[PDB]
């Protein structure tokens, strides 16, 4: 399909402008959520939303709204890099670069050396999205805890000495920094 652009943390007035500029310059379809066709995520205020996180996981451009303003002014979609939100999200340019250099379809390898994980059904952010993030960044998620050495999110079941019980933020901070953060900083009781 046509590449998609996703807005996040975008106030109403700014959404209007983005929609109008895309209608003028073409080249994109606006989607509500980051998905496999998404190449650009535009943020109105640099907050770590799920769309930002999925954007990083997929190696999208994660950009300030000003990219749209200057593209309008100059009459075409201009270079993205000057507007990339690398100060807030260090991994953004790293995954974006990896993705653009990938021969086959891009998939991150951040969690490739981690053991099997199980994500709590009660996780925050929501389990389906959190599992997607782990998978996109090279991790392995089992649908049952029996096989997992890492359990992420709320867990009131029987705990084992052979398992690490971590918060969801271990996953998110790792993705944001492009490095596996220390698990002991994220112990969840």
């Amino acid at each position: 399909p046509t590449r998609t652009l996703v807005m996040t943390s975008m106030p109403s007035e700014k959404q209007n402008v983005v929609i109008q500029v895309v209608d003028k310059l073409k080249g994109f379809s606006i989607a509500p959520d980051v998905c496999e066709t998404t190449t650009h995520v535009l943020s109105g205020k640099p907050l770590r939303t799920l769309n930002v996180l999925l954007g990083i996981a997929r190696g999208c451009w994660v950009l300030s709204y000003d990219w749209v303003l200057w593209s309008l002014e100059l009459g075409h979609w201009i270079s993205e890099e000057p507007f990339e939100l690398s100060h807030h999200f260090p991994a953004a340019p790293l995954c974006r670069s990896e993705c653009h250099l990938s021969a086959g379809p891009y998939r991150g390898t951040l969690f490739a050396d981690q053991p099997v994980m199980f994500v709590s059904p009660a996780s925050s952010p929501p389990v389906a999205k959190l599992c997607e993030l782990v998978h996109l960044c090279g991790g392995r998620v089992s649908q049952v805890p029996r096989q997992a050495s890492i359990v992420i999110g709320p867990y009131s079941g029987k705990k084992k000495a052979t398992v690490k019980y971590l918060s969801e933020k271990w996953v998110l901070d790792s993705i944001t920094q492009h490095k596996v953060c220390a698990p002991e900083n994220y112990l969840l009781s």
Binding site: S9, L47, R48, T49, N51, L172
Partner: peptide
């Protein structure tokens, strides 16, 4: 959208 929630910030996480």
């Amino acid at each position: 959208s929630q910030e996480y």
